[PDB]
Amino acid sequence: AQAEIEQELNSVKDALRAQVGALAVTGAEKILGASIDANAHEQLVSKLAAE
Amino acid sequence: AQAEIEQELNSVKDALRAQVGALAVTGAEKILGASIDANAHEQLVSKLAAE
Amino acid sequence: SEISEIIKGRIEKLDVASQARNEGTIVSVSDGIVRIYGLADVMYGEMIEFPGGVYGMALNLEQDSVGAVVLGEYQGLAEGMNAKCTGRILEVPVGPELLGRVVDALGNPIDGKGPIDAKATDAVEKVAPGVIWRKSVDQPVQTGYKSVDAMIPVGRGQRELIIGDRQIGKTALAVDAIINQKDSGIKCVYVAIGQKQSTIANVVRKLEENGALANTIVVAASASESAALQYLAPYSGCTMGEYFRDRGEDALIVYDDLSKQAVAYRQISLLLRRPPGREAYPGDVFYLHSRLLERASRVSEEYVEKFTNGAVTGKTGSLTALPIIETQAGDVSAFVPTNVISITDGQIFLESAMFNSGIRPAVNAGISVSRVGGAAQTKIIKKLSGGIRTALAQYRELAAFAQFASDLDEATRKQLEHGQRVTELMKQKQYAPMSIAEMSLSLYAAERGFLQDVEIAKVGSFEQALISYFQREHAALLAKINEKGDFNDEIDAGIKAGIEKFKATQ
Amino acid sequence: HSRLLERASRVSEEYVEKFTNGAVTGKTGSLTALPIIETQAGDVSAFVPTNVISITDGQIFLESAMFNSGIRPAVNAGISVSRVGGAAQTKIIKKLSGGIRTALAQYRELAAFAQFASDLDEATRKQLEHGQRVTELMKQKQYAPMS
Amino acid sequence: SEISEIIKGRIEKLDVASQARNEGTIVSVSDGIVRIYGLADVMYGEMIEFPGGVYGMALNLEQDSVGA
Amino acid sequence: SSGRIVQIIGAVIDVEFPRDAVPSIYEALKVQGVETTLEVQQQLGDGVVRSIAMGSTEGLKRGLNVDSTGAAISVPVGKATLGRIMDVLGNPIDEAGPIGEEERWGIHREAPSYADQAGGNELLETGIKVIDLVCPFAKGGKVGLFGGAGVGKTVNMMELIRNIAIEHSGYSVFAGVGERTREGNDFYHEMKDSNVLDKVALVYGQMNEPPGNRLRVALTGLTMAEKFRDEGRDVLLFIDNIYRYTLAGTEVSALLGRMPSAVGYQPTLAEEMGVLQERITSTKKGSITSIQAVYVPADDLTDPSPATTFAHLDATVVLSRDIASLGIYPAVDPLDSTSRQLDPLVIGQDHYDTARGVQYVLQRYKELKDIIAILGMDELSEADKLLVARARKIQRFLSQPFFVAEVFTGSPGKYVSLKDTIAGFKGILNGDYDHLPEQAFYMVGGIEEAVEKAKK
Amino acid sequence: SSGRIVQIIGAVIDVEFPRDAVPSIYEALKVQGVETTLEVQQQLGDGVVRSIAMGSTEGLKRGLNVDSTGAAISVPVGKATLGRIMDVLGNPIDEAGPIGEEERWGIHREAPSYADQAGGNELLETGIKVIDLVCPFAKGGKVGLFGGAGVGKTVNMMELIRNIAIEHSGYSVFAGVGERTREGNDFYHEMKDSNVLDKVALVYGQMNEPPGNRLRVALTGLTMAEKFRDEGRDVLLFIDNIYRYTLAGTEVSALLGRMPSAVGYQPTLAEEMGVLQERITSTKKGSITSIQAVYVPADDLTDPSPATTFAHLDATVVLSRDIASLGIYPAVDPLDSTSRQLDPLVIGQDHYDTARGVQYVLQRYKELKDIIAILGMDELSEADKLLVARARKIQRFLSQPFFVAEVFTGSPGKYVSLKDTIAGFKGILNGDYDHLPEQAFYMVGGIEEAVEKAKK
Amino acid sequence: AELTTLARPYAKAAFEYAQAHQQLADWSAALGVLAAVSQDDTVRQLLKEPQLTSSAKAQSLIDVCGDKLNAPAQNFVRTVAENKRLELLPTIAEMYEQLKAEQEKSVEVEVTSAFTLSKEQQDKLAKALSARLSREVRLHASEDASLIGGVIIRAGDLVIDGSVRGKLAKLAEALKS
Ligand SMILES: Nc1ncnc2c1ncn2[C@@H]1O[C@H](COP(=O)(O)OP(=O)(O)OP(=O)(O)O)[C@@H](O)[C@H]1O
Ligand SMILES: Nc1ncnc2c1ncn2[C@@H]1O[C@H](COP(=O)(O)OP(=O)(O)O)[C@@H](O)[C@H]1O
Ligand SMILES: Nc1ncnc2c1ncn2[C@@H]1O[C@H](COP(=O)(O)OP(=O)(O)O)[C@@H](O)[C@H]1O
Ligand SMILES: [Mg+2]
Ligand SMILES: [Mg+2]
């Protein structure tokens, strides 16, 4: 019974940490979807050409 | 303990919303490999309407 | 208070560069087998990555397509979905961090107690130590049962089969053998193949109630899980048991149903369209169990010093196996039972007729055998088990005369009651393992004639009271015998004096 | 066989009136079936016999040993059974034939046990004597039915 | 359906025609059974001569091949 | 998009869709014009899916357009299903018009996780002497009625339903899988006439229906029970024959392109059984108590289907054809039947000793039976002569007349409390009733009655 | 030239070669960059060959290059193989370095021709009394060994290994067909401790190896034995279990997709047994004699495996658990053990009458012992009590101290000749030793040693 | 069996012949035309009738192609028709090019960029891709508006992804694990 209280608390907070990550992914997606331009696309294509 | 967890949970529920924007700009910055701040302003103040 | 702010930083220390990936496209999906078109560089046994964090293993590398089996749920996969090589073979976490935890066939925690902290991973499929790196089996593994530990002894690095029909104590005998190791030094592994989830939870609840869970790793592949996971679970559990053996220590592994692993491997094979044999099993079903069971072994000091690179020295490691098999109506001539009976070092046969006649442990001592024998016994039990063998053998020969015992000749009538009293001594209760000293009192009392004046119906209360007497007035002698199971003229005289005093007052 | 045998049934007054468009009212309709199956040397484990015994509302087992022993109707009362029971009988036969099949099933067992035993109690001798009479009564000739 | 014995990369019918009816080429070998392509005039139960003094017996005369 | 039928063979149908619109595994499809539903079982490749008809194919043709529904079979769930008779697709098969559903669930689902299982040993009384003695049922446990053809599976289940469901305060689901249509009619009129139909949901898929119907009827009934369990309620789930689910898979397996395994069974016998059986369980929200009847092909308990079923159940009740052939009912085999609740730490030492005592006497008599046939009774020792008498009486005292069997027995039904069950057998084992003739224990409910029958 | 792996399905691998470079049936192939050997089983046609991996196939992929070797699996032969442990391919599994080989031979060849057979039957003098009298072995013969564990099987093999080498200038080969790795390590140390290891070559195919290895190990050991025979020697070939050779053939036949025969065995069962057994014969240069352990499935002597093997056996040696309890360590049963050489037209009238006399006396004593037990010793006639005394003396004179058993017996070993064996038993049957105590006839070797152990 | 398995003998036969007679370009056109003709609904219906002999079906197809087939191609068509394999012509046409490409030391890559296209960009990568593959590269660029920013390069079973969608996927699994 003593250990069950700590695993419950750390499980719920971890489940929350994953939800926060999914919102952060969406934010980063909306930001990039309104920030990529020719000067950045060339850098992405030329950087890939060395890999 | 299940009653105690609900008291602290309602504090983090709103506290997380105050920092998701930072996670989104750093995420976008690491994905692009360059500065993103010039296009972060209007996204940081509006995305919170669905979190 | 919060945690989320200190974990995101680590995620920003992960590579985003492009990586060459060999890829294919799903062409057909059916019964847990996904046929892919492409993947020219995938290896036999390599793991494939599907959309959604689903993984598979390549098993049919044919000329025009790859036949892969899903290590999870395949009802979300579809034609046209992309499939990617990972460059890796299947590996599972290993180390002391697994003790007291319940995990799936891939090492993921299912008990809900949190993430495992394992410091290393190892391959599920590996070769067994070669002939020249082994050492003869000469150390005991006590199961706590008088019938098994006295007549069918199991040694460190041995493979002893538990064979018999349904519902006769096969699981109880193996779980009690695990419970008895909580103070011994042997780490234990229990592998559940094709069992229902509520049954596995009753065994773990019983390991926890008896204090044995903290010394045990529980690997589960329940009846609703993919046949690939049920086929791989024994190899995953074996890999977790091999950690302790290769590092100079001792471990015990229980495969609760090798017959269910064979049934899962048959499903995958007939669905890949591999040519069938007897009872529809594939041509390599003998190699399936043999490749698994030859890993249970005892390795020499030179193998442990070579593996540990000098760190561990002077110690020989081992892995002991207790595979379980179910027979249909006592038919030991079936294909899978015949294979495993020929691979193992000995067999413990449980019988339905004995179990229904009140002989609870149900061990048929007339056909059960251990090829290691007396080398797997301590000095005291090796000396008192010899007469127990003769008395039961005599009872099997002269047991019809029980109804005509009056007309029997006196010598034979003396042998008949001795046989009936030794037979009643073998009866024991579940979750009641006995120590080397406590087993020695019962075996000594019967073998030295101290039961000739006890009614065959009071032999049990006599045993239970005798042990309780010695636990109070002879605690120092029981502690002495429990050091190594040693025997000499002072211990023999000491036990005799205590039994004579017991009869005089209790 | 299941698609064939599920048609043999009793239909309600509401079913007949709808089909007959009101022409027939207040009448139930029925189709009773008597399928026959042949076994090889009494083997019921064969695929087809196993299927049909699991579909019908009962079975009448005819035994070859009984046929050769003089009991020509050859109905094995222990193995044969009706899943409708007393509901398929008229009041007179229903009351008079009460537990006769289960009593015949027990008499066949009592006879084999008491074959080489010493004199038994009145209860046993009485049951053994009563059993040999219903067994002889169940015998009948072909083409000679009884009202 | 399934690929048959005549369906091979080297059975190139560039010159669609038939010649040599008393000679053939071995297509495959397995557990004492040989498939031969081209023996157009072989009789059922006839002795077939292979190199190194070995003999076969013709049992299957098909459209596309001979089984021996 | 839209698909065309390309290949009809028996109950199996192939439908070809655009290569960008291939429906998912287990997805439901609808034929245009004809009223027929097809469930995708396999994706062969090139936009084609292999499906099984949930109806007849006599009216189907090649080239008929098929529509993708985007999901698996969705059946109605909740309070609206109580007091109604339904088919595999959830359509009402009673004349009471439509069902007022407020939600539909998909018949396919994952089994509860390892962390969601719950353990309980509350003892459930049945009122039958043999079961209450050797097979004590527990609330939230899984029971199986194993037996061949004509030994009592339906009758015994009906008696339990009567001795438990009628008193049960919670709801109940009854699923008739591959059952006789006559049994379904008798049970419906029985629940309706008994006023208990209000708390019982009825799903029927009889032997006259296509293989696909008999293959999914069990998932429909279980989906309704899972909705009630997840509401926090205590539920009873009765399945008429779960073997018909395995058999429907054998009937269709070869047409699905699967090679046969041992005893001509589908190679997926153990997984298809595990996927169904792991959902019928009592989690931490609510408790499903379930009774399943298990058919045993040719009375052989070693047949792959019965043999794979034992490991999924808590209580295993075995019915014997040799006992039924002697006019003895219920024909439960005390030496073959078993229960997890049979443990002194769960019930008590007095009950356990009585049960093991009965088993010991019957096990010893199974060997003296042949000894008595050859030679004679006289040649036995007195202890054997005395034991043979008690064994024959105990065998008879296990027989109890049931109310549901009055039509067949002709006598009134009886209900025996476990106390009377323990008392009577203990007395017979002690030898107190050694003064009574053997015929007095046959169908006599409590031991008291036996004392009265001896006087008639 | 070189080919490419085209398909991998378990232990079965298909390899494609140029049309002018297709490898022959049974040819050994090498995968580039991996220690894996493939034996070719069938030529599918169109450049492609079907082979069985002689090792694990984990980590292999399509397109790897494969090299033809020009010949079948070729193993080291001669003196350098003595005192060494090798795998199916002839590699040194012991950590003792490379084998000092001077020559290598392919494992596949035809049996010696009709013209190469020896001109009669010559007994092999094993030096063991019970064997040389009741179970006479012919040179070039096959002996079936029957019995359980812990009855002296290993000690009997070590004594035969010592005697063929020291008393006949021969050598031995041991083929571990499906060897248990624990028992293989124990046997190697027991032979080193018993000083017999330098007289035998050890070839092991362990149980965890693929089916192809377990099938070919018998041919590897037989190839080493053939070399010594050509040298001008009489050789012993020990096969750990001939049933496992049959099963490995069944496994390989199923992997290659062949249609199974009666009781599920391979269609080639009699041919695979004949190819192995026909090489073991007495030629005009030397003679390979074989001792083979035999396992009987389900205790059925009519099963295809026992049936086929018994057709090639010249003698049957049965080891008895009962005899061992008496104290006769050789433990060969004189009544159940038999030989086809026990014919007066082969061993002469004198050897035959002596052996049949011993068996006659031992039979009567076994019948009389049941009389003595049921009715008592006084019920016997004077002639019967005299026979019992000779039978007991005969029974103990069948015992013998072996040079490898000095650690157990505490006495020096003995090698009795056939001449001394016949003379000793002939006297005891005639009564020339009726005055001596039976114990004087226990663990002594020749008959003069019983007379001396008596004076004391 | 896989259409590829059934088409492997026919395709290798066409290629070994075209190579030893220097016709690797003529057969490409002939096989592409034969594959094309067979797929037409009228020709598809004709080839599926029980009235026509193998020679009649074979002849009808050579007549529609005509000059497109050189003497050898027409005979190959007669071999395919005799064996009843006219439904495999599209597959036979495809595998011929693959054997030819490995011979010519070339690859047909299938590049997909997000929102930009430039003549300089195609060559910038064709040098590295050629260097990596050790073959000449016939790029086939196209448009994939689905991508936020980047390009996906497919060549054989190799897939070099440098698209932001790919970095999104990585970041997402990392954050939820
Ligand atoms: N001393 C005993 N030893 C073993 N079993 C006992 C003993 N005393 C009572 N039993 C009971 O016998 C039954 C044995 O069940 P167990 O699960 O071990 O059998 P099993 O053969 O493994 O069954 P299954 O084949 O279904 O797994 C249990 O009810 C157990 O409590
Ligand atoms: N307890 C019982 N009392 C009387 N008849 C019974 C009893 N159990 C079964 N029967 C007989 O068997 C049939 C009903 O059993 P049922 O449940 O249909 O058996 P099963 O389901 O095993 O085929 C009827 O014909 C009935 O006469
Ligand atoms: N000839 C012998 N002389 C003395 N003791 C022997 C002899 N043969 C066997 N034994 C005894 O029997 C045991 C088992 O014999 P062994 O050859 O090892 O049989 P197995 O290999 O089946 O185990 C030996 O360890 C020894 O104790
Ligand atoms: Mg179990
Ligand atoms: Mg029924």
CA distances from H114 to B35, C119, G372, H147 (A): 21, 42, 104, 5
C216 is in an annotated binding site: no
Question: Is-contact F215 F41, C-beta < 8 A?
Answer: no
Please name the member of G188, G251, G253 whose beta carbon is closest to the beta carbon of C284: G251
Query: Between chains, do E28 and G25 touch, taking CB under 8 Å as contact?
Result: no
Q: B41 CB contacts (<8 Å, ≥6 apart)?
A: none
Output Rg (C-alpha) for chain C, integer angstroms.
27
Q: Do the two chains H and E touch, given a threshold of 8 Å on CB pairs and at least 3 pairs?
A: yes
Question: Is-contact G99 G36, C-beta < 8 A?
Answer: no
Half-sphere exposure of F218 (CA within 13 A, CB side): 29
Composition of chain D by helix, strand, coil, percent to 5: 45, 10, 50
Question: Is-contact F29 F52, C-beta < 8 A?
Answer: no
Q: Do the two chains G and E touch, given a threshold of 8 Å on CB pairs and at least 3 pairs?
A: yes
* Nearest partner of C180 among C143, C207, C151, C134, judged by Cα: C143
- Name the method of structure determination: cryo-EM
The SS3 call for residue C346 is strand
Burial grade of A9 (CB within 10 A; 0-12, 13-18, 19 or more) = middle
Buried (b) or exposed (e) across C25-55, using 16+ Cβ within 10 A?
ebbbbbbbbbbbbbbbebbbbbbbbbeeebb
- Report the residue of chain B nearest H164, measured CA to CA: B31
Active site residues per annotation of D: 83
C53 in contact with chain A, both atoms CB, cutoff 8 A: no
* Pairwise CA distance, residues D22 & G130, whole Å: 101
Angle formed by the axes of helices C285-293 and C258-271, nearest 10°: 140
From ligand 4's centre to the CA of C199, what distance in Å? 9
Query: Between chains, do B39 and A43 touch, taking CB under 8 Å as contact?
Result: no
Query: Between chains, do G45 and E31 touch, taking CB under 8 Å as contact?
Result: no
The SS3 call for residue F36 is coil
From ligand 1's centre to the CA of C432, what distance in Å? 13
Question: Is-contact C491 C484, C-beta < 8 A?
Answer: no
Tokens, residue H60? 């009808």
Please name the member of H114, H160, H171 whose beta carbon is closest to the beta carbon of A41: H114
- Classify F108 in phi/psi space as left (phi over 0), alpha (psi -120 to 50) or beta: beta
CA distances from D81 to A11, D57, D76, D133, F331 (A): 61, 9, 10, 21, 14
Tokens, residue G220? 């590897």
From ligand 1's centre to the CA of F429, what distance in Å? 25
Question: Is-contact C482 C437, C-beta < 8 A?
Answer: yes
Pocket probe for ligand 3: among G129, G153, G154, the residue whose CB has the most ligand atoms within 8 Å is G154
Question: Which residue type does C493 have?
Answer: A
Question: Which residue type does G375 have?
Answer: L
For tokens 């048609």, the residue is: D7
For tokens 């110690």, the residue is: C315
* Pairwise CA distance, residues C156 & G331, whole Å: 30
| DSSP conformation class of G413 | -
Angle formed by the axes of helices F349-373 and D100-113, nearest 10°: 60
* Pairwise CA distance, residues C23 & H159, whole Å: 7
Buried (b) or exposed (e) across C97-110, using 16+ Cβ within 10 A?
ebbbbbbbbbbebb
**Chain H residue numbers touching B31 (CB-CB < 8 A):** 164, 167-168, 171
Buried (b) or exposed (e) across G113-126, using 16+ Cβ within 10 A?
eeeeebeebbbbbb
* Nearest partner of F155 among F296, F329, F395, F398, judged by Cα: F329
Q: H120 CB contacts (<8 Å, ≥6 apart)?
A: none
* Pairwise CA distance, residues C195 & C202, whole Å: 12
* Min distance H17 CA to chain B CA atoms (Å): 52
Size of interface C-H (CB pairs under 8 A): 39
Query: Between chains, do C42 and G61 touch, taking CB under 8 Å as contact?
Result: yes
* Nearest partner of F221 among F286, F172, F278, F154, judged by Cα: F172
Half-sphere exposure of C450 (CA within 13 A, CB side): 23
Query: Between chains, do C79 and F41 touch, taking CB under 8 Å as contact?
Result: no
Q: Is the dihedral of CA G230, G231, G236, G237 positive or negative?
A: negative
Composition of chain E by helix, strand, coil, percent to 5: 5, 30, 65
- What is the length of chain F? 456
Residue F356 appears among annotated catalytic residues:
no
* Pairwise CA distance, residues F88 & F39, whole Å: 12
Question: Which residue type does G80 have?
Answer: A
Q: What are the phi and psi torsion angles at C224 (to 5°)?
A: -85, -10
* Pairwise CA distance, residues G172 & G229, whole Å: 11
Per DSSP bridges, beta strands F171-177 and F234-239 are parallel
Quick one: how far is CA F418 from the chain centroid? 23
* Triad G277, G279, G284: Cα angle to 5°: 135
Q: Which of A20, A29, A41, A43 to mutate to test the interface with H (most CBs of H within 10 A)?
A: A41
Question: Is-contact C95 C249, C-beta < 8 A?
Answer: no
Structural resolution in Å: 3.0
CB-CB neighbours of B45 under 10 Å:
10
**Chain B residue numbers touching A48 (CB-CB < 8 A):** none
* Pairwise CA distance, residues H62 & C86, whole Å: 48
- Classify C141 in phi/psi space as left (phi over 0), alpha (psi -120 to 50) or beta: beta
* Min distance A49 CA to chain H CA atoms (Å): 5
Q: Which of B5, B10, B17, B26 to mutate to test the interface with C (most CBs of C within 10 A)?
A: B26
- Classify C463 in phi/psi space as left (phi over 0), alpha (psi -120 to 50) or beta: alpha
Q: Is the dihedral of CA G221, G227, G233, G234 positive or negative?
A: positive
Question: Is-contact F134 F339, C-beta < 8 A?
Answer: yes
Q: Does any ligand 3 atom lie closer than 6 A to the CB of residue G359?
A: no
Which of C247, C274, C360, C371 is labelled catalytic?
C371
- What is the length of chain C? 506
* Pairwise CA distance, residues C31 & C271, whole Å: 8
CA distances from G440 to C130, C204, G267, G443, G450 (A): 48, 64, 56, 8, 5
* Nearest partner of C138 among C370, C319, C317, C373, judged by Cα: C373
Which residues of F are annotated as part of the binding site for ATP? 147-154
For tokens 């037989």, the residue is: G222
Pick the ligand that lies closest to the CA of residue D53. 2
- Report the residue of chain D nearest F368, measured CA to CA: D113
Q: H or E stretch including C38?
A: strand C33-38
The SS3 call for residue E37 is strand
Half-sphere exposure of G447 (CA within 13 A, CB side): 19
* Pairwise CA distance, residues F203 & F224, whole Å: 10
Query: Between chains, do A31 and B33 touch, taking CB under 8 Å as contact?
Result: no
* Pairwise CA distance, residues G32 & F201, whole Å: 67
* Pairwise CA distance, residues F112 & F117, whole Å: 7
C275 in contact with chain F, both atoms CB, cutoff 8 A: no
* Pairwise CA distance, residues C223 & C194, whole Å: 4
**Chain B residue numbers touching H167 (CB-CB < 8 A):** 31
CA distances from G214 to A34, D24, G27, G52 (A): 67, 81, 18, 12
Please name the member of G25, G42, G45 whose beta carbon is closest to the beta carbon of E27: G45
* Nearest partner of G76 among G102, G95, G94, judged by Cα: G102
- Measured from the Cα of G147, ligand 3's closest atom is 22
* Pairwise CA distance, residues F311 & F301, whole Å: 13
DSSP G161-216: HHHHHHHSS-EEEEEEEEE-HHHHHHHHHHHHHTT-GGGEEEEEEETTS-HHHHHH
* Nearest partner of F105 among F81, F75, F85, judged by Cα: F75
Please name the member of F257, F268, F275 whose beta carbon is closest to the beta carbon of C267: F268
* Nearest partner of G243 among G288, G285, G305, judged by Cα: G305
The SS3 call for residue F6 is strand
Closest-CA residue, ligand 1 atom 24, reads C167
* Pairwise CA distance, residues C270 & C260, whole Å: 16
Which 3-state string (H, E, C) describes F59-120? CCCCCCEEEECCCCCEEECCHHHCCCEECCCCCECCCCCCCCCCCEEECCCCCCCHHHECCC
Q: G1 CB contacts (<8 Å, ≥6 apart)?
A: G17, G18, G20, G21, G68
Half-sphere exposure of G127 (CA within 13 A, CB side): 19
Half-sphere exposure of F103 (CA within 13 A, CB side): 10
* Pairwise CA distance, residues D21 & C119, whole Å: 82
* Pairwise CA distance, residues C292 & H162, whole Å: 43
Q: What are the phi and psi torsion angles at D81 (to 5°)?
A: -160, 150
Q: Does any ligand 3 atom lie closer than 6 A to the CB of residue G56?
A: no
* Pairwise CA distance, residues C210 & C205, whole Å: 9
The SS3 call for residue C344 is coil
- Report the residue of chain G nearest C279, measured CA to CA: G264
* Nearest partner of C135 among C316, C308, C293, judged by Cα: C316
The DSSP bridge partners found for residue C29 are C34, F43
Per DSSP bridges, beta strands C91-94 and C66-70 are unpaired
* Pairwise CA distance, residues F389 & F364, whole Å: 12
Q: H or E stretch including F201?
A: strand F200-205
CA distances from G436 to C386, G365, G384 (A): 34, 19, 18
The SS3 call for residue B16 is helix
From ligand 3's centre to the CA of A37, what distance in Å? 87
* Nearest partner of C327 among C342, C317, C338, judged by Cα: C338
* Pairwise CA distance, residues F417 & F128, whole Å: 8
From ligand 5's centre to the CA of F292, what distance in Å? 12
Quick one: how far is CA C139 from the chain centroid? 17
DSSP H18-53: HHHTT-TTHHHHHHHHHHHHHHSHHHHHHHT-SSS-
Quick one: how far is CA F365 from the chain centroid? 31
Residue F364 appears among annotated catalytic residues:
no
Query: Between chains, do E16 and H16 touch, taking CB under 8 Å as contact?
Result: no
* Triad G446, G451, G452: Cα angle to 5°: 95
DSSP C42-105: --TTPEEEETTTEEEEEEEE-SS-EEEEESS--TT--TT-EEEE-S---EEEESGGGTT-EEET
* Nearest partner of F271 among C32, C85, G211, judged by Cα: C32
Q: What are the phi and psi torsion angles at G3 (to 5°)?
A: -115, -175
| DSSP conformation class of F332 | B
Tokens, residue G441? 């006839």
Output Rg (C-alpha) for chain B, integer angstroms.
15
Pick the ligand that lies closest to the CA of residue F319. 2
The DSSP bridge partners found for residue C141 are C154
DSSP C264-325: HHHHHHHHTTPPB-GGG-BTTHHHHHHHHHTT--BB-HHHHHHHTTTSS-S---EEEEEEEE
Question: Is-contact C414 C395, C-beta < 8 A?
Answer: no
Pick the ligand that lies closest to the CA of residue G409. 3
Residues of H within an 8 Å Cβ radius of E: 1, 5-6, 8-10, 12-13, 16-17, 72, 75-76, 78-79, 83
Q: Does any ligand 2 atom lie closer than 6 A to the CB of residue F151?
A: yes
Question: Is-contact C104 C229, C-beta < 8 A?
Answer: yes
Q: Does any ligand 3 atom lie closer than 6 A to the CB of residue G323?
A: no
Sequence-ordered alpha helix ranges (H) in F278-417: 304-309, 321-324, 349-373, 382-397, 406-409
- What is the length of chain E? 68
Query: Between chains, do G188 and C131 touch, taking CB under 8 Å as contact?
Result: yes
* Pairwise CA distance, residues G332 & G147, whole Å: 10
Instruction: Give contacts of A 11-50 with B, CB under 8 A.
Output: 12-13, 16, 20-21, 23-28, 30-32, 34-35, 40, 43-44, 47
